[PDB]
Design an enzyme around this catalytic site. Sequence first.
Site, PDB file in Angstrom:
ATOM      1  N   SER A 145       0.861  -1.187   0.000  1.00  0.00           N
ATOM      2  CA  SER A 145       0.000   0.000   0.000  1.00  0.00           C
ATOM      3  C   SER A 145       0.896   1.236   0.000  1.00  0.00           C
ATOM      4  O   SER A 145       1.650   1.416  -0.972  1.00  0.00           O
ATOM      5  CB  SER A 145      -0.995  -0.131   1.156  1.00  0.00           C
ATOM      6  N   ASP A 242      -8.373  -2.458  -7.343  1.00  0.00           N
ATOM      7  CA  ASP A 242      -7.886  -2.202  -5.994  1.00  0.00           C
ATOM      8  C   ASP A 242      -8.909  -1.425  -5.171  1.00  0.00           C
ATOM      9  O   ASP A 242      -9.514  -0.464  -5.651  1.00  0.00           O
ATOM     10  CB  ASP A 242      -6.567  -1.432  -6.065  1.00  0.00           C
ATOM     11  N   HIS A 286      -7.069  -5.532  -1.578  1.00  0.00           N
ATOM     12  CA  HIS A 286      -6.018  -4.557  -1.292  1.00  0.00           C
ATOM     13  C   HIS A 286      -4.967  -5.230  -0.417  1.00  0.00           C
ATOM     14  O   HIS A 286      -5.309  -5.803   0.622  1.00  0.00           O
ATOM     15  CB  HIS A 286      -6.601  -3.317  -0.592  1.00  0.00           C
TER      16      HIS A 286
END
Length: 338
Positions: A145, A242, A286
């Site tokens: 991330s 995502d 994610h």
Amino acid sequence: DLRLHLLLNTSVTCNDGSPAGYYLKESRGSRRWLLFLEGGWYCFNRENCDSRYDTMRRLMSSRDWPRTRTGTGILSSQPEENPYWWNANMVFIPYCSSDVWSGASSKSEKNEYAFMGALIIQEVVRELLGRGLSGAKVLLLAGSSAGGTGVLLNVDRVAEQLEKLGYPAIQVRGLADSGWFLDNKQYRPTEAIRRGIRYWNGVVPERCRRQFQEGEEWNCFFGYKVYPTLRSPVFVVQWLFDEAQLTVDNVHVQEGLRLYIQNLGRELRHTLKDVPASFAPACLSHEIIIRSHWTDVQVKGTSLPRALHCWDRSLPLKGCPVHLVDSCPWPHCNPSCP
Ligand SMILES: *[C@@H]1O[C@H](CO)[C@@H](O)[C@H](O)[C@H]1NC(C)=O
Ligand SMILES: CCC(=O)Nc1ccc(C)cc1O
Ligand SMILES: CCC(=O)Nc1ccc(C)cc1O
């Protein structure tokens, strides 16, 4: 279990001035080192950094950190959970600078918070050299991330730092998980990064900086823009749909939204066409690489641990691919999605 070390150089600090650090588990019979960058959004002015400090304080301070951390996914030491690098030296670097690992600004009389993400990475590397890193053969800088974007911003600087310290033999590489975003039209954010960079005194790679120049360095936070300027080998993992991307796009099903989502997948796939080392399944999710069940997902019959092992060998192979991008156009047309 990974063991915590606060930085001996106490001038390299988390947001509130407390020392930064790293969690470490050594593997004396290995010359491979994995340094992983945590994610967790960011803050770009005084008001919303104050808010973050009330309710996400472990991402702004080390005062409450635990002394150990269990390695999971690619940070696991058990071969059943980590077929890729189970015997490597494991490092977990907590995200306590709220700057997408880009800042280089100290707390002072004019700054309520410190934003030192870029300098935290350098200091961790510098102190690790005295605990075994001097003998490494490969340093894989990975992250998820905000940590994934942080890999893209810092991998070449880590290579440069090791060259200038007298270690040309260590091979530095990058693994960016879920940090490859698109500055697309929303269904119903570039200003936040531009304001953040000025707030953090943030830094970007030099190639990328010289292309876009003054006031336009926010462009280098976008994978498809900064990747072609990098020299170190980088493997890119990204879900085609995502959740963080869709959230910022204000997506939470009619023709309009169907076409929107289908077009997001096609554009993301386009930006990956000339990325030779990549893994991009057609899923809504994610992050992946430190999840315990990261072994289950597959693209065209190949798992992510396999793809990463194939990448190691590559550095065209029969039956051991490295470029794996789904072609089907809707979330979870790939049956192995989470
Ligand atoms: C500690 O880190 C700061 C920031 O990178 C640097 O200015 C200072 O020289 C470092 N201290 C030592 C002893 O290297
Ligand atoms: C989880 C934090 C996050 O998504 N940070 C972030 C913001 C913008 C861009 C372009 C890349 C980024 O990594
Ligand atoms: C073109 C306007 C805009 O900023 N779009 C945008 C959407 C999503 C993300 C993650 C970053 C973005 O920059």
